[PDB]
Amino acid sequence: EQMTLRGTLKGHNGWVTQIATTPQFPDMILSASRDKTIIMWKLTRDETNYGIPQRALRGHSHFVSDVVISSDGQFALSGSWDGTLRLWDLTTGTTTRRFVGHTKDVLSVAFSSDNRQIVSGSRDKTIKLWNTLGVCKYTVQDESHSEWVSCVRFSPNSSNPIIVSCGWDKLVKVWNLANCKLKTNHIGHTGYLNTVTVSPDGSLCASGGKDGQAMLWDLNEGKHLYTLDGGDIINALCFSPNRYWLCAATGPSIKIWDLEGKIIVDELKQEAEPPQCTSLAWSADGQTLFAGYTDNLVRVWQVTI
């Protein structure tokens, strides 16, 4: 098990901020950018190009911060510094719905497993729950973060209906999805938080940001498990879909940790400051890790023995 650079995706004119993949369309991936667009890529996989831009999703009036695809792979949900969310029909490449409610930049978006619910985190310090019709059903304002909410994620475990969030208040908050009331405050971080991610079984949550420590929290028990040293600002986190791996975009490199031995499997670097990695997303088959950078490129990392 070792990763190598297979290729790059050139098209964006600004930083790549997020990457989204779908099991229904393995030859198609989405990327969010500071160039205000989301690019739909066509994965060609040839001697000249790994992928090519198929379509560009335009409409947001500022940096696109987050992008996620629906379970059927037919729709995309984006968030932007314009203070709105947008639902996109992938076939037409059109916005079908605008989500107006946040009073500041939207930093994070997410679809619930059933795709019936939508969450957003914003610079306005609130977490908003919406339906697919752009109606805000709930605003979490109170026992909420006292600073910018940088990331909001759902857990795939239906027995413990939960939303996880992190913010610039250095806290990780676990919310009961049924009543939208605080379940747990996870104290430990010494710096602002950029990201939170939930494992495929919904038992683990990894948080990261400024302090460079990837902290693992048990969602079932409501307790800290262990911490992994990222040794640089953590910009993004994701668990492998098919491996017991935790991936962190630590400054310019990508640190891959084996959760069994709590050890580095690999560290993916490019060879005055180098491009910083901002986003990570595993392909449908879990053999390809796509990563976004501050040099506007998407780098394609492939699993090889």
From Swiss-Prot:
Q: Does the keyword Ion transport apply?
A: no
Places the protein is found: Cell membrane; Cytoplasm; Cytoplasm, Perinuclear region; Nucleus
Q: Which residues carry this modification: N6-acetyllysine?
A: 128, 181
Q: Known consequence of changing residue 138 to F?
A: No effect on binding to SRC
State what changing residue 226 to F does: No effect on binding to SRC. Does not abolish phosphorylation by SRC. Abolishes phosphorylation by SRC
A Gene Ontology cellular-component term: nucleoplasm
What Gene Ontology terms describe what this protein does at the molecular function level? BH3 domain binding; cadherin binding; cyclin binding; cysteine-type endopeptidase activator activity involved in apoptotic process; enzyme activator activity; enzyme binding; identical protein binding; ion channel inhibitor activity
Major location category of this protein:
membrane
User: Any idea which residues bear Phosphotyrosine here?
Assistant: 50, 226
From the UniProt record, list the WD repeat ranges: 11-42, 59-89, 101-131, 144-176, 188-218, 229-258, 272-302
Pfam families according to UniProt = WD40
Q: How is it modified after translation?
A: Phosphorylated on Tyr-226 and/or Tyr-244 by SRC. This is required for binding to SRC.
Query: Tissue specificity, please?
Result: In the liver, expressed at higher levels in activated hepatic stellate cells than in hepatocytes or Kupffer cells. Up-regulated in hepatocellular carcinomas and in the adjacent non-tumor liver tissue.
The reported effect of residue 244 to F is: Abolishes binding to SRC. Does not abolish phosphorylation by SRC. Abolishes phosphorylation by SRC
**One Gene Ontology biological process:** positive regulation of mitochondrial depolarization
Outcome of substituting residue 192 to F: No effect on binding to SRC
UniProt keyword terms in alphabetical order:
Acetylation, Apoptosis, Biological rhythms, Cell cycle, Cell membrane, Cell projection, Cytoplasm, Developmental protein, Gastrulation, Growth regulation, Host-virus interaction, Membrane, Nucleus, Phosphoprotein, Repeat, Ribonucleoprotein, Ribosomal protein, Translation regulation, WD repeat
Superkingdom per UniProt: Eukaryota
Family in the record: Belongs to the WD repeat G protein beta family. Ribosomal protein RACK1 subfamily.
Main function:
Scaffolding protein involved in the recruitment, assembly and/or regulation of a variety of signaling molecules. Interacts with a wide variety of proteins and plays a role in many cellular processes. Component of the 40S ribosomal subunit involved in translational repression. Involved in the initiation of the ribosome quality control (RQC), a pathway that takes place when a ribosome has stalled during translation, by promoting ubiquitination of a subset of 40S ribosomal subunits. Binds to and stabilizes activated protein kinase C (PKC), increasing PKC-mediated phosphorylation.
Subunit note: Monomer; also forms homodimers and homooligomers. Interacts with CPNE3. May interact with ABCB4. Component of the small (40S) ribosomal subunit. Interacts with the 80S ribosome. Binds NHERF1. Forms a ternary complex with TRIM63 and PRKCE. Interacts with HABP4, KRT1 and OTUB1. Interacts with SRC (via SH2 domain); the interaction is enhanced by tyrosine phosphorylation of RACK1. Recruited in a circadian manner into a nuclear complex which also includes BMAL1 and PRKCA. Interacts with AR. Interacts with IGF1R but not with INSR. Interacts with ADAM12. (Microbial infection) Interacts with Y.pseudotuberculosis yopK.
This chain's protein is named Small ribosomal subunit protein RACK1
Species for this entry: Homo sapiens
